[PDB]
């Protein structure tokens, strides 16, 4: 009798881990060129035809699926980094991949997971401490320099992303956009309206809040489309002919009672209207639909009404305008009412967007970006989201590190020169770690088709005993202190990178064998 | 009507794509390409004509290019990787002429005049060459080899090629050389180092006796007629009517055979040679027994048309009858020895012949059959290089100089030309920059920088300083010993321009049975 | 537009890696089969032919390979066997790892030309250094260095435990056919010592014959089976019922002759038989058949006659006993006579039974000696294993004796060459210096494979050997360390002379030449077109 159920199998020992390392390299090479200012972009197609185009590595890895364990580990680590930082995901996936590649041949001869895991963990610890100790910072606490370096880090983020002609333009845009936000830094108070047509340069920042005008019945277009200081009431109440609680029943006996009841329903409606009108507000917004009678009344009363508004829209309305959400009208007073100095139903690219500005309070913003492709606008919006993430993390800890591969060569040099005191196979394996730590600038150079060997040689010579912060320019194709080129990115990215890299290395090197069920559950 | 124009555009695009397909195999720094056939073979290849051949494609344009490459190899022989690139580049350039309202007949006439000017452009560019001048021919053939894969032993494959052209024909005057004079053999196994030459020839069959396997100063004999039992060309049967007749038949058969063998032995022969035949062949066991009793070699079953090679090499001449067989007609070679290939067969090399032979043979060995195939094709194309060199004596150095010179001077002609033809001439001028662009590209260079550098160098008017793959840029070529005959370039250009004039005229394709 | 190729083109490093992949897949598959600790690999043919094999070429030859470069490596292994016959497994591994290093290097974006020229020059320098800086003497040995060579041959084989008897046997067998070619140097007729085998009792039950044993037996028990003195008559003429000529027809109107013609059919044969039997013939050897007429006559004479005798063996035995090849009795002219001046010389011939079957055996061909080995084993497969083992050993020893030069091994040559070439490679200081460095590194696989096949701590021993060789080279004051190699008997750095581990220099030279040749061949391959199949 078969010991286990029929259909299973298992690979073991060196062959299993060799296959795993091979899978790691195969999945790694799929994004070999994305990162870098000169990045070259990829596409995917699904069975629904919703083709998606992106150069941010983590999103790319989600766009792809595997069944291999190691590659699944890689893609989930990419998920973790993206949720953690949102930049350099390409860098972390790549780097772990070449560590595993560099260690591959070591399995064929005498070597055990113990020493390699200990070396990986201790090196990761020491290098994270290095990250903390030599991370650059403003250390100035003045808002001018703070804002300047926020924009510099934003363009650093764009120093490997798609757009490169609007770096400072969009950096200042997003920095201001977040500086009209509170200390909560809520991720729901950032309106996004992708607009067809219009140049990429025409993307803008609404100081107040704008949104889309939802469908409305007849009786519109008599309302005044302009006011110079309206007052806003934020509702969540229905202005439509509705039964009381959907279960009410009416039991009368004569036509007079019938007429009294129907006129009474009308009186309820018109009394709510009277409360609203006499309240003094000039506009009303709500999730709930507005009956045509109310719209005709407000047009007759020169007042604007709108319903069926999505919640997040109303949330932004409260958070910026300064009003308060209402489910009831009976206790409407001044403190509940919002207030702004500008209302207008403007036209932005063949659409009808309701614009509310002139609010002295402003704790939320709604981006209005212009372009000609849903996919390219989506990619730009994704990069905007990435920039939001990077600045939101960095705004807490205003300490960063220079991009352009300078810091990676710094840490590689540190590990190398220190990896001459450590003993034995630990020393050799740590040297392999350090050698694997020398690819990302090389990959940037070869992305642009440059002689990366020569570039790395010269920058290593310059890093050895001739100063630090030397990065690789691509428009100049040379080496110099490109830290003063202000390509600076946060260091918690580096720490998280090392954490995930050590995690992955020790995980996959701990792999020894796997049994595969016949997977009848399909 | 437009559909003919769309067909024309489609054909031009197909030709361009086919040409671009082989854009990593040109010149000194080209790269090989696998062609695995549907059959159970495989071919590593670098020569353009070969590559073009193995694609059994169905599109007419590539077939035209294949036949063009065949014609060029017949004319010149080397590196037909370039001509396809030139043809495709001219087609792409004339796409721009077509979109700019230039009638196809007008385009063809523009090509004709461009050909006219370019002939002189190359002609004045070149300089004559000295026959028997070792260095010029050596550099020409070596640079020819540098477009192939066996360049690692060029120091060995050059002297053999040069000695071939000295010892095959006289350097006095021939205007052309018979290639079938030169002979080669390919053998599986051995090494590139084992490759060598002999001024004689080698025979494949091994002597039917092991008693004598290396004879020196032998009087070699060649025989081509039947040796078997007495039998008429026409049918018969010898009827025996008793035991005595049987006895006489046996004794007289023996007597006739030994009489013949004694005739040849009396002629002073040392080594026997028997041709191949069917239908009562020309060898008997009793003959071998007799020859062993008199210490004589024999080789049997040899080819018909090879008689001239053997007779010219050794001096022994064919006889179909014993009566015309004479002792004076013995070819005398110093040494006939059998060699071993370390368990890979036994040959027979004939050396020290006293008769003047005008044919030579060379051997090639290597770790496999494809390496020796590539070396054979390379040596054949080098022999073609030298045949063109002696055909007419004019040279042109490489380094990208010729095409850029022609490009810039056609640019000047366009500057000095008016009418519709001016822009066509400009298009010609811009066309000859593809080859240097490819040479810089596959050399791992930034094409814009180096190509513009050479363009400016030929704007200065100074030359002998062109593309250098050792310096890494534009530098001197005479020290690089990079030279090709003017004839190969002239043939390439003329064949390409005639082909493309045919192309421009042609615009319609129809499918038949 | 789309390429008219109609086939499939793969570009980039993929096919390169695929060649690597090919160079990977087979390599480790045969990895377990060379060195004193190489274990056997079992192969089952599709028709149920299970096989034992340890030498690489025999291992690979029956694999079916469709990947081109892998086929190329296949015939590379086959040639490594057919000329050298030793290192039967090492060469494919060396080439595979060389391809690994090369393809990784090109993946780091270096011009292929620099690395290919590096390959050629490094092959040349390596062969050179092997030639000069490891010269030792074999005249200090002899009749015992051959024993040690046989020991190194059997190291991975099946009889590595009982080498004391077998090595002496094989060296004496070599001495038994030692011939001279150019009258100043020796010569060996390879494949002229028939090794006929039997599913005997044990390896210790095989015996060597100072004579010759056919695959042949006595035609009938009527003949005497032990002739006192051997005057041998070798024949190629077919002794069947004589047929005059294929182009004769009889026409008889006088019937009296008719019956007498029936007589003739015998007479001629019979007559020659008398002639054959006039000279006191002892044994008759013919390729042609022998019928009842000749059988009865030979029984009446008591002289052995064997039909269906092969040809090459007949030539061997005729030369050994001094006999002569005969196809007819005709002399320099029509006189057909038999001469008693060339009869083969031997002591006696017997139809000896070995296990359960008999065979013809020749005793002491006169004026010289001859070699043939009767391989008796527990079964057929392992006996074939000794067959291959001893063939390989004879190839090794004939290479040794042709060129009396040998150096110790077990990684001794490997580590010494690696140390030289790594401490060398400053003659260029350029893009090719790194190439020479990778050559010095890539020879690390031989100690690696030996250690993994022996479960030794590879790094410690390789460091010890490398340090000794490095200090010997850079400091020639104590150059004695250059006479040290690695032995897997106990994982020891030893003077590889007491074990006798010794291999001909030409073997390493030739293997290195073909290895680098194939490596260059592949490194000048970059693109593949898969044409549509027929």
Curated annotation (Swiss-Prot), chain A:
Residues annotated for Mg(2+) binding in this entry: 87
CDD domains hit by this protein: TCP1_eta
Record-linked InterPro entries: Chap_CCT_eta, Chaperone_TCP-1, Chaperonin_TCP-1_CS, Cpn60/GroEL/TCP-1, GroEL-like_apical_dom_sf, GROEL-like_equatorial_sf, TCP-1-like_intermed_sf, TCP-1_chaperonin
Alphabetized UniProt keyword annotations: Acetylation, ATP-binding, Chaperone, Cytoplasm, Hydrolase, Isopeptide bond, Methylation, Nucleotide-binding, Ubl conjugation
UniProt effect for mutating residue 374 to K: Found in a patient with developmental delay, intellectual disability, pyramidal and cerebellar signs, cerebellar vermis hypoplasia and hypoplasia of the corpus callosum; uncertain significance
Superkingdom field: Eukaryota
GO molecular-function term, one example from the UniProt record: ATP hydrolysis activity
Matching PROSITE patterns: TCP1_1, TCP1_2, TCP1_3
Sites of N6-acetyllysine modification: 62, 245, 315
Catalytic activity of the protein: ATP + H2O = ADP + phosphate + H(+)
One cellular component (GO) term of this entry: cell body
Pfam family, one: Cpn60_TCP1
UniProt record, GO biological process: binding of sperm to zona pellucida; chaperone mediated protein folding independent of cofactor; chaperone-mediated protein folding; positive regulation of protein localization to Cajal body; positive regulation of telomerase RNA localization to Cajal body; positive regulation of telomere maintenance via telomerase; protein folding; protein stabilization
Record disease entry: De novo genetic variants in nearly every subunit of the TRiC complex, including CCT7, have been found in individuals with a broad spectrum of brain malformations, and clinical phenotypes ranging from mild to severe epilepsy, developmental delay, intellectual disability, ataxia, and other features of cerebral malfunction.
Functional summary from the UniProt entry: Component of the chaperonin-containing T-complex (TRiC), a molecular chaperone complex that assists the folding of actin, tubulin and other proteins upon ATP hydrolysis. The TRiC complex mediates the folding of WRAP53/TCAB1, thereby regulating telomere maintenance.
UniProt protein name: T-complex protein 1 subunit eta
Species name: Homo sapiens (Human)
From Swiss-Prot, chain B:
UniProt-listed InterPro entries: Chap_CCT_delta, Chaperone_TCP-1, Chaperonin_TCP-1_CS, Cpn60/GroEL/TCP-1, GroEL-like_apical_dom_sf, GROEL-like_equatorial_sf, TCP-1-like_intermed_sf, TCP-1_chaperonin
Coiled coil: none
Reactions accelerated catalytically: ATP + H2O = ADP + phosphate + H(+)
Residues modified to N6-acetyllysine: 262, 276, 293, 300
Annotated residues for binding of Mg(2+): 78
Binding residue positions for ATP: 27, 79-80, 148
Recorded GO MF terms: ATP binding; ATP hydrolysis activity; ATP-dependent protein folding chaperone; protein folding chaperone; RNA binding; unfolded protein binding
GO CC aspect terms: cell body; cell projection; centrosome; chaperonin-containing T-complex; cytosol; extracellular exosome; melanosome; microtubule
Phosphoserine modified-residue sites: 10, 158, 176, 418
EC main group: hydrolase
The enzyme's E.C. designation: 3.6.1.-
Principal location: cytoplasm
GO biological process: binding of sperm to zona pellucida; chaperone mediated protein folding independent of cofactor; chaperone-mediated protein folding; positive regulation of protein localization to Cajal body; positive regulation of telomerase RNA localization to Cajal body; positive regulation of telomere maintenance via telomerase; protein folding; protein stabilization
UniProt keyword annotations, A-Z: Acetylation, ATP-binding, Cell projection, Chaperone, Cytoplasm, Cytoskeleton, Hydrolase, Methylation, Nucleotide-binding, Phosphoprotein
Binding site for ADP: 27, 79-82, 146-148, 399, 484
Subcellular localization(s) per the UniProt record: Cytoplasm; Melanosome; Cytoplasm, Cytoskeleton, Microtubule organizing center, Centrosome; Cytoplasm, Cytoskeleton, Cilium basal body
Keyword flag Secreted: no
Disease: De novo genetic variants in nearly every subunit of the TRiC complex, including CCT4, have been found in individuals with a broad spectrum of brain malformations, and clinical phenotypes ranging from mild to severe epilepsy, developmental delay, intellectual disability, ataxia, and other features of cerebral malfunction.
Similarity comment: Belongs to the TCP-1 chaperonin family.
PANTHER family, per database record: CHAPERONIN
Protein name: T-complex protein 1 subunit delta
Curated annotation (Swiss-Prot), chain C:
Chain positions found as Phosphoserine: 4, 489
GO MF, any single term: RNA binding
Top-level enzyme category: hydrolase
Top-rank taxon, per record: Eukaryota
Location in the cell: Cytoplasm, Cytosol; Cytoplasm, Cytoskeleton, Microtubule organizing center, Centrosome
UniProt modified residues of type N6-acetyllysine: 197, 398, 492
EC number: 3.6.1.-
Effect of residue 5 to L: In a breast cancer sample; somatic mutation
The keyword Transmembrane is annotated on this UniProt entry: no
UniProt: ADP binding residues: 35, 87-90, 156-157, 410, 503
Post-translational modification Phosphotyrosine, affected residues: 179
GO annotations of cellular component type: acrosomal vesicle; cell body; centrosome; chaperonin-containing T-complex; cytosol; extracellular exosome; Golgi apparatus; heterochromatin
Entry's Gene Ontology BP terms: binding of sperm to zona pellucida; chaperone mediated protein folding independent of cofactor; chaperone-mediated protein folding; positive regulation of establishment of protein localization to telomere; positive regulation of protein localization to Cajal body; positive regulation of telomerase RNA localization to Cajal body; positive regulation of telomere maintenance via telomerase; protein folding
Catalysed reactions, as listed in the record: ATP + H2O = ADP + phosphate + H(+)
Phenotypic consequence of residue 36 to L: In IDDPMGS; uncertain significance
UniProt-annotated binding residues for ATP: 35, 87-89
NCBIfam families referenced in this protein's UniProt entry, alphabetically: chap_CCT_alpha, thermosome_alpha, thermosome_beta
Stated role: Component of the chaperonin-containing T-complex (TRiC), a molecular chaperone complex that assists the folding of actin, tubulin and other proteins upon ATP hydrolysis. The TRiC complex mediates the folding of WRAP53/TCAB1, thereby regulating telomere maintenance. As part of the TRiC complex may play a role in the assembly of BBSome, a complex involved in ciliogenesis regulating transports vesicles to the cilia.
PANTHER family: CHAPERONIN
Family statement drawn from the similarity comment of this UniProt entry: Belongs to the TCP-1 chaperonin family.
The name this protein goes by in its record: T-complex protein 1 subunit alpha
Organism the protein comes from: Homo sapiens (Human)
């Amino acid at each position: 009798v078969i010991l286990l159920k029929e259909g299973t199998d298992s690979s073991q020992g060196i062959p299993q881990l060799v296959s795993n390392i091979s899978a790691c390299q195969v999945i790694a090479e799929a994004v070999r060129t994305t990162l870098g200012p000169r990045g070259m972009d990829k596409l995917i197609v699904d069975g629904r035809g919703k083709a998606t185009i992106s150069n941010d590595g983590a999103t790319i890895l989600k766009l792809l699926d595997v069944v291999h364990p190691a590659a699944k580990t890689l893609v989930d680590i990419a998920k973790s980094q993206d949720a953690e930082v949102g930049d350099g995901t390409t860098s972390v996936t790549l780097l772990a991949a070449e560590f595993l590649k560099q260690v591959k041949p070591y399995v064929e001869e005498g070597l055990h997971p113990q020493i390699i895991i200990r070396a990986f963990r201790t090196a990761t610890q020491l290098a994270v401490n290095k990250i903390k100790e030599i991370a650059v910072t403003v250390k100035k606490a003045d808002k001018v320099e703070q804002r300047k370096l926020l924009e510099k880090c934003a363009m650093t983020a764009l120093s490997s992303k798609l757009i490169s002609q609007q770096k400072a333009f969009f950096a200042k845009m997003v920095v201001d956009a977040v500086m009209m936000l509170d200390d909560l830094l809520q991720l729901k108070m950032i309106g996004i309206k992708k607009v067809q047509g219009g140049a990429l340069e025409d993307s803008q920042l609404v100081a107040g809040v704008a949104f889309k005008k939802t469908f409305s019945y007849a009786g519109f277009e008599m309302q005044p489309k302009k006011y110079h200081n309206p007052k806003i009431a934020l509702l969540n109440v229905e202005l439509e002919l509705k039964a009381e609680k959907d279960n009410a029943e009416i039991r009368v006996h004569t036509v007079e009672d019938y007429q009294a009841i129907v006129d009474a329903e009308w009186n309820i409606l018109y009394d709510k209207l009277e409360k609203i009108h006499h309240s003094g507000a000039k506009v009303v917004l709500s999730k709930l639909p507005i009956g045509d009678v109310a719209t005709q009344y407000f047009a007759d009363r020169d007042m604007f009404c709108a319903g069926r508004v999505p919640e997040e829209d109303l949330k932004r309305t409260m958070m910026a305008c300064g009003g308060s959400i209402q489910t009831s009208v009976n206790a409407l007073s001044a403190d509940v009412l919002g207030r702004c100095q500008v209302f207008e139903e403007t036209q932005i690219g063949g659409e009808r967007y309701n614009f509310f500005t002139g609010c002295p309070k402003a704790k939320t913003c709604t981006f209005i970006l212009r372009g000609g492709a849903e996919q390219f606008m989506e990619e730009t919006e994704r990069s905007l989201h990435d920039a939001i993430m990077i600045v939101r993390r960095a705004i807490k800890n205003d300490s960063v590190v220079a991009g352009g591969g300078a810091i990676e060569m710094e840490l590689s040099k540190y590990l190398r020169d220190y990896s001459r005191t450590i003993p034995g196979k630990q020393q050799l394996l740590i040297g392999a770690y350090a050698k694997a730590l020398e690819i990302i600038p090389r990959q940037l150079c070869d992305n642009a088709g440059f002689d990366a060997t020569n570039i790395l040689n010269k920058l290593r010579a310059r890093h050895a005993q001739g100063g630090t912060w030397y990065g690789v320019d691509i428009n100049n194709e040379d080496i110099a202190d490109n830290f003063e080129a202000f390509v600076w990115e946060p260091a918690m990215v580096r720490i998280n990178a090392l954490t995930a890299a050590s995690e992955a290395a020790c995980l996959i090197v701990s792999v020894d064998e796997t049994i595969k069920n016949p997977r009848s559950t399909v | 009507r437009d559909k003919p124009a769309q067909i024309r555009f489609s054909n031009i695009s197909a030709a361009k794509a086919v040409a671009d397909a082989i854009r990593t195999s040109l010149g000194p720094k080209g790269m090989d390409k696998m062609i695995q056939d549907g059959k159970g073979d495989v071919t590593i290849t670098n020569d353009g004509a070969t590559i073009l051949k193995q694609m059994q494609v169905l599109h007419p344009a590539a077939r035209m290019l294949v036949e063009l490459s065949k014609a060029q190899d017949i004319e010149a022989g080397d590196g037909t990787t370039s001509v396809v690139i030139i043809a495709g580049s001219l087609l792409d350039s004339c796409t721009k002429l077509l979109q700019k309202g230039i009638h196809p007949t007008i385009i063809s006439e523009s090509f004709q005049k461009a050909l006219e000017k370019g002939i002189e452009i190359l002609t004045d560019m070149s300089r004559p060459v000295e026959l028997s001048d070792r260095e010029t021919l050596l550099n020409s053939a070596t640079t020819s080899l540098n477009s192939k894969v066996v360049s690692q032993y060029s120091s060995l494959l050059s002297p053999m090629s040069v000695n071939a052209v000295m010892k095959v024909i006289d350097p006095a005057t021939a205007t052309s050389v018979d290639l079938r004079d030169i002979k080669i053999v390919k053998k599986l196994g051995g090494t590139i180092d084992d490759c060598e030459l002999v001024e004689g020839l080698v025979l494949t069959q091994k002597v039917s006796n092991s008693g004598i396997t290396r004879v020196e100063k032998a009087k070699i004999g060649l025989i081509q007629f039947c040796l078997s039992a007495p039998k008429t060309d026409m049918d018969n049967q010898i009827v025996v009517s008793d035991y005595a007749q049987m006895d006489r038949v046996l004794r007289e058969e023996r007597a006739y055979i030994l009489n013949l063998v004694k005739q040849i032995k009396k002629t002073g022969c040392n080594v026997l040679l028997i041709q191949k035949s069917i239908l009562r062949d020309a060898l008997s066991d009793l003959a071998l027994h007799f020859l062993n009793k008199m210490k004589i070699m024999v080789i049997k079953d040899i080819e018909r048309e090879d008689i001239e090679f053997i007779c010219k090499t050794i001096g022994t001449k064919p006889v179909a009858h014993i009566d015309q067989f004479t002792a004076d007609m013995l070819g005398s070679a110093e040494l006939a020895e059998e060699v071993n290939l370390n368990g890979s067969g036994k040959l027979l090399k004939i050396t020290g012949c006293a008769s003047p032979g005008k044919t030579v043979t060379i051997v090639v060995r290597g770790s496999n059959k494809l390496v020796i195939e590539e070396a054979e094709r390379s040596i054949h194309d080098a022999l073609c290089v030298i045949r063109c060199l002696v055909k007419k004596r004019a040279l042109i150095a490489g380094g990208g100089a010729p095409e850029i010179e022609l490009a810039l001077r056609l640019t000047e002609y366009s500057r000095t030309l008016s009418g519709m033809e001016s822009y066509c001439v400009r298009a010609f001028a811009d066309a000859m920059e593809v080859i240097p662009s490819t040479l810089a590209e596959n050399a791992g260079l930034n094409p814009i920088s180096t190509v513009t550098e050479l363009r400016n160098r030929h704007a200065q008017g100074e030359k002998t300083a062109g593309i250098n793959v050792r310096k890494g840029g534009i530098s001197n070529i005479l020290e690089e010993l990079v030279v090709q005959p003017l004839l190969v370039s002239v043939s390439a250009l003329t064949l390409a321009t005639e082909t493309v004039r045919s192309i421009l005229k042609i615009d319609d394709v129809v499918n038949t049975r | 537009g789309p390429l008219s190729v109609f086939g499939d083109r793969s570009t980039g490093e993929t096919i390169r890696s695929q060649n690597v992949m090919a160079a990977a897949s087979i390599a480790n598959i045969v990895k377990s089969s060379l060195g004193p600790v190489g274990l056997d690999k079992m192969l089952v043919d599709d028709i149920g032919d299970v096989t034992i094999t340890n030498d690489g070429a025999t291992i690979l030859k029956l694999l079916e390979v469709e990947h081109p470069a892998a086929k190329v490596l296949c015939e590379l292994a086959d040639l490594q066997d057919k000329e050298v016959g030793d290192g039967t497994t090492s060469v494919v591994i060396i080439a595979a790892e060389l391809l690994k290093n090369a393809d990784e290097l090109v993946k780091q974006k270096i011009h292929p030309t620099s690395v290919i020229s590096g390959y050629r020059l490094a092959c040349k320098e390596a062969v050179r250094y092997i030639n000069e800086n490891l010269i030792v003497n074999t005249d200090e040995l002899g009749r015992d260095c051959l024993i040690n060579a046989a020991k190194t041959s059997m190291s991975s084989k099946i009889i590595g435990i009982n080498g004391d008897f077998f090595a002496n046997m094989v060296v004496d067998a070599v001495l038994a056919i030692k011939y001279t070619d150019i009258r100043g140097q020796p010569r060996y007729p390879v494949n002229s010592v028939n090794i006929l085998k039997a599913h005997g009792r044990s390896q210790m039950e095989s015996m060597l014959i100072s004579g010759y044993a056919l695959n042949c037996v006595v035609g009938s028990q009527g003949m005497p089976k032990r002739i006192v003195n051997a005057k041998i008559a070798c024949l190629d003429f077919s002794l069947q019922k004589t047929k005059m000529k294929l182009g004769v027809q009889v026409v008889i109107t006088d019937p009296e002759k008719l019956d007498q013609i029936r007589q003739r059919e015998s007479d001629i044969t019979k007559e020659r038989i008398q002639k054959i039997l006039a000279t006191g013939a002892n044994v008759i050897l013919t390729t042609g058949g022998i019928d009842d007429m000749c059988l009865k006559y030979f029984v009446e004479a008591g002289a052995m006659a064997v039909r269906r005798v092969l040809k090459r063996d007949l030539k061997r035995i005729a030369k050994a006993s001094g006999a002569t090849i005969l196809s007819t009795l005709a002399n320099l002219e029509g006189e057909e006579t038999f001469e008693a001046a060339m009869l083969g010389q031997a002591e006696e011939v017997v139809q000896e039974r070995i296990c359960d079957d008999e065979l013809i055996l020749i005793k002491n061909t006169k004026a010289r000696t001859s070699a043939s080995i009767i391989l008796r084993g527990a079964n057929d497969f392992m006996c074939d294993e000794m067959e291959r083992s001893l063939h390989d050993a004879l190839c090794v020893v004939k290479r040794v004796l042709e060129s009396k030069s040998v150096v110790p091994g077990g990684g001794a040559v490997e580590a010494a060459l690696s140390i030289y070439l790594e401490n060398y490679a400053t003659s260029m200081g350029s893009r090719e210096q790194l190439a020479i460095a990778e050559f010095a590194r890539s020879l690390l696989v031989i100690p690696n494979t030996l250690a993994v096949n022996a479960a030794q701590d590879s790094t410690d021993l390789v460091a010890k050997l490398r340090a000794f060789h490095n200090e010997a080279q850079v400091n020639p004051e104590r150059k004695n360390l250059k006479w040290i190699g690695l032995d897997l008997s106990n994982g020891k750095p030893r003077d590889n002379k007491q074990a006798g581990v010794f291999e001909p220099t030409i073997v390493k030279v030739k293997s290195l030449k073909f290895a680098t040749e194939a490596a260059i061949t592949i490194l000048r391959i970059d693109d593949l077109i898969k044409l549509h199949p027929e």
